[PDB]
Amino acid sequence: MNIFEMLRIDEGLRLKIYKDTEGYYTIGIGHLLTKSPSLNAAKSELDKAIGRNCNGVITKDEAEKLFNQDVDAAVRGILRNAKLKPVYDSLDAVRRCALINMVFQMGETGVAGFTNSLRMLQQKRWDEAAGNLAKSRWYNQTPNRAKRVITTFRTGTWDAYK
């Protein structure tokens, strides 16, 4: 199991514009297009992103290309962030994937806001961090996905995805 297989399980694959769990315009493998309410604002963002007139539809290949960018952007953003980098460096390979997963979903700023949970991960207090992380809107909004990520951090194994 690797980061890609993990996110693909969590986000799914859709070749046509759709609305995410929060009502936003998305495509492919969890690629947010716009928080605006317009479908047209989404269709324009999409074409800017692909470099063609897509009219709201893309190929698998295009979806993958976007996914490669997003994962890379997520890893670079963690490494660049003063709050996140130290956490990432203190972690083992499995737990590292769990932090990337959060960052891809919620953005660097959002994750950087879980101060307390971040401090406990850095301290290796697995049970207590799992417990604090569950106390969030994130967990209340997408419970099955958050539980998967949380188990990843508690255990250090790929059990939830298996």
Q: Which residues of this protein are in contact with Cl ion, per CB under 5 A?
A: 135, 142, 144-145
Contact 94, 152 (CB under 8 A): yes
Residue 117 labeled ligand binder: yes
Q: Which of 11, 62, 70, 108 is catalytic?
A: 11
13 vs 39, beta carbon nearer Cl ion: 13
Query: Residue 14 Cβ, how far from Cl ion at the closest point, in Å?
Result: 16
Provide CB contacts within 8 A for 35, sequence distance 6+.
24, 25
* Residue 67 annotated in ligand binding: no
Min CB(89)–Cl ion separation in Å: 28
Dihedral angle of Cα 139, 141, 145, 150, to the nearest 10 degrees? -10
Q: Burial level of 107, CB count in 10 A (0-12/13-18/19+)?
A: middle
**89 belongs to the catalytic site:** no
In the bound state with Cl ion, the residue whose beta carbon lies nearer, of 2 and 141, is: 141
Catalytic residue among 5, 10, 20, 47: 20
Q: Please confirm, yes or no, whether 22 is among the known catalytic residues.
A: no
Minimal distance, residue 117 CB to Cl ion, in Å? 12
**How many degrees, rounded to 5, is the angle at CA 117 between CA 91 and CA 158?**
50
**Binding site: what residues are annotated?**
32, 104, 117, 132
